[PDB]
Amino acid sequence: NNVYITKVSAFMPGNPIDNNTMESVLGFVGGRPSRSRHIVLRNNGIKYRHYALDPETGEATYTSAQLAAEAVKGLVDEHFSLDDMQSLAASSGTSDQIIPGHGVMVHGELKNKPCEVISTSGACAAGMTAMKYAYLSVLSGATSNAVSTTSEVPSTVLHARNFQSENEARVAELERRPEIAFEKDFLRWMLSDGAGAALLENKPRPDGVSLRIDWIDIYSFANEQETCMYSGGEKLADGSLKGWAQMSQADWLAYSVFCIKQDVRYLNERVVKFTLTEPLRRIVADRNLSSESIDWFLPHYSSEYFRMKFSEGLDDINFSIEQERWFTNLTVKGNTGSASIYIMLDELMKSGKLKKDQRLLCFIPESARFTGAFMHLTVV
Amino acid sequence: NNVYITKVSAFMPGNPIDNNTMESVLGFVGGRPSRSRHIVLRNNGIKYRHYALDPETGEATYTSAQLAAEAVKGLVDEHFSLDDMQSLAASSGTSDQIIPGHGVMVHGELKNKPCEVISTSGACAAGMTAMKYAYLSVLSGATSNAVSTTSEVPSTVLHARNFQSENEARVAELERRPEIAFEKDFLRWMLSDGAGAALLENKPRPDGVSLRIDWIDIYSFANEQETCMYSGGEKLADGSLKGWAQMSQADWLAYSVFCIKQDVRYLNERVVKFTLTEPLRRIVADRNLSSESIDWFLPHYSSEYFRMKFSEGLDDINFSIEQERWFTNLTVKGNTGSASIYIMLDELMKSGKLKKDQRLLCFIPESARFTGAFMHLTVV
């Protein structure tokens, strides 16, 4: 009983948007430009990204459910139609609503016949917990195929309108040039929109390359790490997170409780050890891994600032992988959060660089409260 | 390989609250008592329920993460300790925050050692997609045990404070009737708080009874049914759902965008067909089931009004099951959403009424956008 990725699909809304255009798309808070955009862009290295926003009108061009539906429809070919789907697992850190779950909204867009639909939640790793669900479904024999998909439209919550009531509130407290906290403004030049999907099957395709999933290992370090990326709440001085419904309605607006925030200094101190080295050293030992066997390393490292910090982490645990074997399109596609690993896998599989028997290691960290997800693939 | 539920656990916050006491815990909107509470209670037949709310001082007694952690802790005994957990799958229709996912917040409360943590999302069926993830983990051989847990604290969003800006906006608009619509007040007398947890293992336990999971089948009918229960958005005239981030910040408050709403006429028209009869007649045909072979039917039917309507649905597909084989504790535990099936299973496994070889059919509908989840169990 084996599981193979036989088709991957990526969908980026609209056109690539360069560093000089992006602020006009995401808007000015309180009539003024962002103070730190320039150095955020310099540190993260990202040069283009996509937003599900109309360039001329600023209207939304895709809900999160539509974006995911577009990616799933990219899996359809002569070997697979939507109605063949035996199980659909979907996630989005930026779901359009709180209830219903994201997956049934995607099913509503796809309109394929009644089938099993699962939603996973969280952030960067949620696309990988959806993929592991789909993997387990086929591996166990519950189904002979499954589809996982994830989508991200943080443009919905990064646009300047998401901070207007906060700006107006500080103007009623008479401050002259109020600026939103860096913990809020920072993610606005980091996160962008994208969606991916994967078809998993219990036999490889007759022609072309398939990727056998050998395993998917996931570890949470929330038992001792604090929340680090959060929305729908506010992080307290003691490190705990206060949920939005424990705050007053007035405060939701005055503090932008529903925008995405990052405890940047805490991230910087702990992301490498508690998303990479602590889980990977466990997995290396338990599975008897050799870094020399890995032909392709696909890391979602979010920001050029962390590329070599993660590489140092691999060194510290005797699992060095030279930059020549690292594959990523972060700089050109954007940090699409949970979709990043799908947008990487999509390009590598369609590139023609893969060779039979080659081995792939996928690393998907989630700084939200420090999860590391890892997947080992073998080309067949 | 096989999967056994070897322990179930349930946690109700606080003391049972009766029909006369409940509105003082949940509050008046705009100083006036609710006009619909009496008939909603008349129709749902519920007499007790629990809220994670201090009844003297009104403050929260458990977050959703804490409520689930209390349930997971109920699983611990001489045969299982928290650190033996190879996988945790958690869900909540009322997560404390949007990011991170509910599961890693549960882990942060439990503080057990690093392990795999997965979150599922949605409403009533999300407890069962979480359980099916745990079941597939053990069925596939990925792990030898797994824990699923779900928690509900709708009290956080049903309290009167969640409607106070809309009341003010309706007073300010000079509405002849300033009360909030039935579609927003209805669920305040329907939904209540509770959590459950289940331990799944690849061998039964020697002492006492175990429940072998024969299968879990799930169907979504969102391909043709509109959204029906929803929060963090609003239903448009054309039946689509507009997500909260597409609405102005002022409208979030003016219209209570983040409260839980239900389209009651659409619910009443469609919930029996598209959560019970359409999925179950598929399951019955595919697995060649006979209603005569089921010793215990455990249905989450939410309201007395629907008990015989679901029973009628069984008749329509020639799967009649008479009331003496139904097991529920709704009237005395409340409608706890996704937790309901855990709270039914907890009582039944502890009642001593289960005999070896008896067969259980669990039915968990989700009206949110019409999913039916079904689980078949055999006492060993």
For this entry, what is the oligomeric state of its chains?
Answer: homodimer
Q: Which sequence of SSEs, written as H and E, runs from N to C of chain A?
A: EEHHEHEHEHEHHHEEEEEHEHEHHHEE
The largest chain-to-chain contact, stated as pair and per-chain residue counts, equals: A-B, 83 and 83 residues
Characterize the biggest β-sheet of chain A.
9 strands, mixed
Distance between the termini of chain A: 15 Å
Structural class of chain A: alpha+beta
Number of helices of chain A: 13
Break the fold down into its secondary structure elements and pairings:
2 copies of one chain form a homodimer.
Chain A (H helix, E strand, L loop, with lengths): L3 E8 L5 E2 L3 H5 L10 H8 L3 E2 L14 H10 L13 E5 L10 H9 L5 E5 L5 H14 L5 E8 L2 H4 L5 H9 L9 H4 L8 E8 L9 E10 L8 E2 L2 E3 L5 E3 L5 H6 L6 E2 L1 H24 L8 E4 L4 H13 L13 H4 L6 H12 L7 E8 L4 E9 L1
Helix pairs in contact in A: 3-4, 10-11
PDB class: transferase
Keywords: Ketosynthase, Transferase
Assembly: dimeric
